[PDB]
Ligand binder design. Structure first.
Ligand code: HEM
Ligand code: HEM
Ligand SMILES: Cc1cc(N)nc(CCc2cc(CN)cc(CCc3ccc4cc[nH]c4n3)c2)c1
Ligand SMILES: Cc1cc(N)nc(CCc2cc(CN)cc(CCc3ccc4cc[nH]c4n3)c2)c1
Ligand SMILES: [Cl-]
Ligand SMILES: [Cl-]
Lengths: 361, 361
């Protein structure tokens, strides 16, 4: 069964991939090489072209992603050659540096060796390569509550956070054959952070908010042609609302709206004053302003939705079915001001794609 | 088949209704009366208690409605006795007056005679009893574009709008046996309108915006126990975002955001300035303020979501499955600031319920 699943996924993928690459005539011979390879080895190895286009197709198929217009420009780094934890660490450091690109963020994916017998070669524990720690104890909450479980797991490995609201979690991953993950502190020179200030409201710096420049999702599985790349961290740039309407605003995250309300000089007393909405807008304006001011890539949700509309038009023009998850595609502020809100999307799962996998902690 | 559908829906409804009313023991005898009635007449007649609780259950089952906490307080007006167009007209006028209640809006439904052989006794053409006309011609757009088709249909019946942006459409409905609907101008004394002003920004009145006090949906079919009440207009009060984030803001409706931006003194030039979001918040604050100032019922989306959370808790506590359509339940501004956004809802259709039906024009 295992092998039959693999073979069927490989056939569909290679046929589709090669068609898109204009290599339609090579499908037959490649499929033959793959089938015998699967027969012999229980698996097969992607060519660099297949892997690269596979990661791009996976992004293009990511229903929840508004940023897919740029799918074909994904920078794919093939690190299927890594074998040691230092090679993994340096590959992760490299991804951060090359994706960050001095602020002009390059959408990048680094692809590590894939699972073999469902057995991981590299198991990344981080949810994002760059993320803040979270702590909860003695009534006290510090940092990002979303990171509490990983933070506690890290501190079981002998790491200790300074317990600021913005401690960078170390990289943490486990190699095949090791019982415990290893952790490495992020070099701060690698990590761009953006202080959050507001273009018009000077008191906004009193909140001492900041966020990191590059969201590098590191806990999803890239599946391409039946091959499971469980370790394949990827990044785009932020859409401002992710930071301003969610990371800094959610009650279960940094929960900053009341403080925002206070510094922008509005009462946070009456639902009918829409103070939360006003705070959200000002916080989101601040986030966009701050990233732009620092020369770090970011997109506002209106521009992002306009780009997504072009992705829709490109899909229709290429004869590709468009898939989408409306609930994730609409931005969390002024969604009805985007075209996304006013149409529907087929939430079908098409592969290649990125998938959730169980946390190792 | 027709009759079998009816009988099965009746059994389920009566059993459920009577259970909720503590009349469990009367189900058997009532079901017998109904079956013989269906046998004899091809249909059956709801008792006033069944009809009332039916309309309430239908509201309680309305997946898209955030206002359902108050389902059990629906004021049900039974107008199954009407036979003439003047009785229908006066019943509609009465609904407007009694629902409006001098601004302290009473959620009300007026139930007209149900379809018989699928044949309507009363066919209401209005989408809402109170709504503004829309016109498009010679490049020029006036009023509410959403009403363009009905407006044109009305003007085919000898009605003529003044072509302000806020012409009240007349009531328009067709009686069984008549080829053409009749129309009646709404008495202006019946119709509460609210001028839109802003609590802090005096220039906001320069927009000369207004909206009507009571949304009275008049084109949906109430289905209860297999009986199709195609004419059963109902109303709640507005949630502010419906007016401020949709009716006045949508590009395909009144499209007021650029004008709002101008009067609140912000540039409408750059997506990154989030001027649309800021305009939306200020427009929505104005709408809530204006309704409150005029003593007309309205709810803000935060309060509405808190009420909905209580509806969820009430459902769980009553042992009723909760159904919901997340895409309609989230408000179109700051949805992530509500609990609704952060959970999922079973969008199953449970009857009794309100359903779309084909437009007669
Ligand atoms: C180029 C800039 C990018 C932007 C602005 C962007 C935007 C977004 C946003 C805003 C979301 C979350 C939507 C929400 O919270 O409701 C998202 C989800 C996602 N994006 Fe993108 N994205 C970008 C690049 C990428 C890249 C390069 C990949 C992969 C190669 C990717 C794959 C995904 C996936 C898989 C999700 C869903 C994650 C999940 O289910 O938790 N995106 N994107
Ligand atoms: C009491 C005040 C009420 C409030 C604040 C309220 C709120 C809302 C809102 C905001 C929506 C639309 C959601 C959206 O646009 O995304 C809605 C939809 C709906 N409401 Fe309510 N509602 C109320 C009363 C009622 C009543 C009395 C009924 C019927 C007896 C009702 C039945 C519905 C139905 C059927 C829909 C869906 C309409 C459609 O599919 O087009 N609501 N409600
Ligand atoms: C590569 C990349 C770039 C970018 N700019 N953004 C992302 C998405 C990051 C992300 C990751 C996760 C973890 N599953 C969640 C979210 C938002 C999650 C979320 C949470 C709740 C809701 C409700 C409706 N939509 C919702 N979406 C966002 C990924
Ligand atoms: C009784 C009642 C009271 C009240 N306050 N609001 C309503 C709902 C009125 C309404 C009617 C219709 C017509 N189908 C539509 C809408 C909003 C429609 C809408 C349109 C687009 C989207 C996208 C996501 N959700 C969306 N919802 C709202 C009904
Ligand atoms: Cl994030
Ligand atoms: Cl409306």
């Amino acid at each position: 069964e295992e092998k039959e699943i693999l073979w069927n996924e490989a056939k569909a993928f290679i046929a589709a991939c090669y068609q898109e690459l204009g290599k339609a005539a090579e499908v037959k011979d490649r499929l033959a090489d793959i089938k015998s390879e699967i027969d012999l080895t229980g698996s097969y190895v992607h060519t660099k072209e297949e892997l690269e286009h596979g990661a791009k197709m996976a992004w293009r198929n990511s229903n929840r992603c508004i940023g897919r217009l740029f799918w074909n420009s994904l920078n794919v780094i093939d690190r299927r050659d890594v074998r040691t934890k230092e090679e993994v660490r340096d590959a992760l450091f490299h991804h951060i540096e090359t994706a960050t690109n001095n602020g002009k963020i390059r959408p990048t994916i680094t692809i590590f060796p894939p699972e073999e017998k469902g057995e991981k070669q590299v198991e990344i524990w981080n949810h994002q390569l760059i993320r803040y720690a979270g702590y909860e104890s003695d009534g006290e909450r510090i940092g990002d509550p979303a990171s509490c479980s990983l933070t506690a797991a890290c501190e079981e490995l002998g790491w200790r956070g300074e317990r600021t609201d913005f401690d960078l979690l170390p990289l943490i991953f486990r190699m095949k054959g090791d019982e415990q993950p290893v952790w490495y502190e992020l070099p701060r020179s690698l990590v761009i952070e953006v202080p959050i200030t507001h273009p018009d409201i000077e008191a906004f710096s009193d909140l001492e908010l900041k966020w990191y420049g590059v969201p590098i999702i590191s806990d999803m599985k890239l599946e391409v042609g039946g091959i499971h790349y469980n370790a394949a961290p990827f990044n785009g740039w932020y859409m401002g609302t992710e930071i301003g309407a969610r990371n800094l605003a959610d009650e279960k995250r940094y929960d900053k709206l009341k403080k925002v309300a206070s510094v922008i000089g509005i009462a946070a007393d009456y639902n009918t004053d829409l103070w939360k909405d006003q705070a959200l807008v000002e916080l989101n304006k601040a986030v966009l302003h701050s990233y732009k001011k620092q020369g770090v890539s970011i997109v506002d949700h209106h521009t992002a939705a306009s780009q997504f509309k072009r992705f829709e038009e490109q899909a229709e023009e290429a004869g590709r079915k468009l898939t989408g998850d409306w609930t994730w595609l609409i931005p969390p502020i002024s969604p009805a001001a985007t075209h996304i809100f006013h149409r529907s999307y087929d939430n079908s799962i098409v592969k290649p794609n990125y998938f959730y996998q169980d946390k190792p902690y």
